């Protein structure tokens, strides 16, 4: 498959007044790993992150064009972008190439810059949006992540429990996927701060 | 009063073309002589200062090994035509594996004559005629030929012709001295003589340029020494 060419995994998860987004760190070409610190999660504002799995070229290029459009948006209007609006903007960008699509399945996680109400969502490679109140996943180990997140996720979690949950889910899902891993990075964002942690993971 | 670049005068003429002909009168004078031994081309360089390197004045160029060209008027406008001529000769060699006849090249360059005009055209098409007169001097299967061209696009074969500011004088002088059995030596000599007559500043080796095309020898631009050897016999 094309999506399995580089592999990779991205997950986002809701909490109470907080939200979390994690990804593995491997940049690998099929079986071979080239680097272990590859960025898959891009800040699109304070308190709004986008998570991109898939083909690493389109990861980088979708991230970049999204930052393009976003900067323009935040300059024309005098405000950071709302998450819904970011979602629709990504959707538009992906659907523009409906007949030669970017091979990325983005995940968005962020707090409404006016309120604090957490938002998570994911999109197709052609930009079909999908919002949930629990979690969203993307990548080569989607099944795994679904399996962990259905069994670990509780509703009103505090930042520490959101952390423990998304961490265990990512770790155990990713450790049963051959082309995902080489480290896990987890961004738990709340109204007051943003915590970024890198977990101890297997390197095989 | 504004009119177009493609307007006719009641006397039946295009004002841009006529004005261009007027623009030639200001150019440096040039002489071409056709001869059964070859064709010669001279032009006076019109250096404005001893500080100006005269070797960077070329009003005589090689279109191809058997075709040379002497130009008068707006040189910058001449460069475009000369390039188009070179490309044309080479395309004909590419395609048919034989050199261009001087008349064919001349014709080709003459097609870019009246190719000017405003609306109803490409965004990179010409706005006005070429303010230049040319003398093409070549050798082909019909032997030594010399053609003259003006911004009207009319080109015509000539035995001996002059273009430039001292066109009239030099042409009369040429008529007085030309016959269809001159040697190339007499032709060059005559040319340098008439040139000295019409030139403002004194004729010398770094003041004119001179070139011949003979049937057995490719286009030859005369060096300083080769010029000196001729100017010596004033």
């Amino acid at each position: 498959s094309i999506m399995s060419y580089n592999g990779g995994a991205v997950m986002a998860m809701k909490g109470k007044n907080c939200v979390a987004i994690a990804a593995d760190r491997r940049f690998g070409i099929q079986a071979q790993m080239v680097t272990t610190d590859f960025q898959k999660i891009f800040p699109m504002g304070d308190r709004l992150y986008i998570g991109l799995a898939g083909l690493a070229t389109d990861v980088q290029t979708v991230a970049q064009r999204l930052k393009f459009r976003l900067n323009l948006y935040e300059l024309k209007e005098g405000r950071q972008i709302k998450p819904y609006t970011l979602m629709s903007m990504v959707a538009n960008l992906l659907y523009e190439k409906r007949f030669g699509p970017y091979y990325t399945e983005p995940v968005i996680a962020g707090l409404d810059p006016k309120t604090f109400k957490p938002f998570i969502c994911s999109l197709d490679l052609i930009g079909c949006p999908m919002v949930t109140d629990d979690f969203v996943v993307s990548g080569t180990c989607a099944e795994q992540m679904y399996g962990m997140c259905e069994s670990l996720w509780e509703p009103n979690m505090d930042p520490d429990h959101l952390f423990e949950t998304i961490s265990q889910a990512m770790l155990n899902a990713v450790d049963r996927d051959a082309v995902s891993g080489m480290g896990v990075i987890v961004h738990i964002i709340e109204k007051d701060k943003i915590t970024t942690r890198t977990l101890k993971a297997r390197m095989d | 009063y504004d009119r177009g670049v493609n307007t006719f005068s009641p006397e039946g003429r295009l004002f841009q073309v006529e004005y261009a002909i007027e623009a030639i009168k200001l150019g440096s004078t040039a002489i071409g002589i056709q001869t059964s031994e070859g064709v010669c081309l001279a032009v006076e360089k019109r250096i404005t200062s001893p500080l100006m390197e005269p070797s960077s004045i070329e009003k005589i160029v090689e279109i191809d090994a058997h075709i040379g060209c002497a130009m008068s008027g707006l040189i910058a406008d001449a460069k475009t035509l000369i390039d188009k001529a070179r490309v044309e000769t080479q395309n004909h060699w590419f395609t048919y594996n034989e050199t261009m006849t001087v008349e064919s090249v001349t014709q080709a360059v003459s097609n870019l004559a009246l190719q000017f005009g405003e609306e109803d055209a490409d965004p990179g098409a010409m706005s006005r005629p070429f303010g230049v007169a040319l003398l093409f001097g070549g050798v082909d299967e019909k032997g030594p030929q010399l053609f003259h061209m003006d911004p009207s696009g009319t080109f015509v074969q000539c035995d001996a012709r002059a273009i430039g500011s001292a066109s009239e004088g030099a042409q009369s002088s040429l008529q007085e001295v030309y016959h269809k059995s001159m040697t190339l030596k007499e032709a060059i000599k005559s040319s340098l003589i008439i040139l000295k007559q019409v030139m403002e500043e004194k004729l010398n080796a770094t003041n004119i340029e001179l070139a011949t095309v003979q049937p057995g020898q490719n286009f030859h631009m005369f060096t300083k020494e080769e010029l000196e050897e001729v100017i010596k016999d004033i």
């Binding site: - | 009063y1 007027e22 009168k25 500011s165 004088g169 019409v198 403002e200």
Partner: protein, 86 residues
């Protein structure tokens, strides 16, 4: 060509000019200037010729005048705008 020579010769015929210098050359450098301007030259040299201290003018005296009048006073001319009768 032949005209201006008559214009030059007529105009300068009445003053102390250098007999070596041939108005023909000057006339050549005068494509389309009326016979009036040609007059600013003939008298123009007068200044130059007087500006040093000389009786008779030289070729350059005219040349300069030609380049001094014609060219310099070209922006004005109005002989090219009045040709098309504007």
């Amino acid at each position: 060509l032949e005209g201006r020579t008559h214009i030059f010769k007529i105009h300068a015929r009445s003053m102390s000019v250098e007999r070596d210098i041939r108005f023909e050359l000057l006339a050549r450098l005068c494509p389309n200037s009326t016979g009036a301007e040609i007059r600013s030259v003939c008298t123009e040299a007068g200044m130059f010729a007087i500006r040093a201290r000389r009786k008779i003018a030289t070729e350059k005296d005219f040349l300069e005048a030609v380049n001094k009048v014609i060219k310099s006073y070209a922006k004005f001319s109005a002989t090219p705008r009045y040709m098309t009768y504007n």
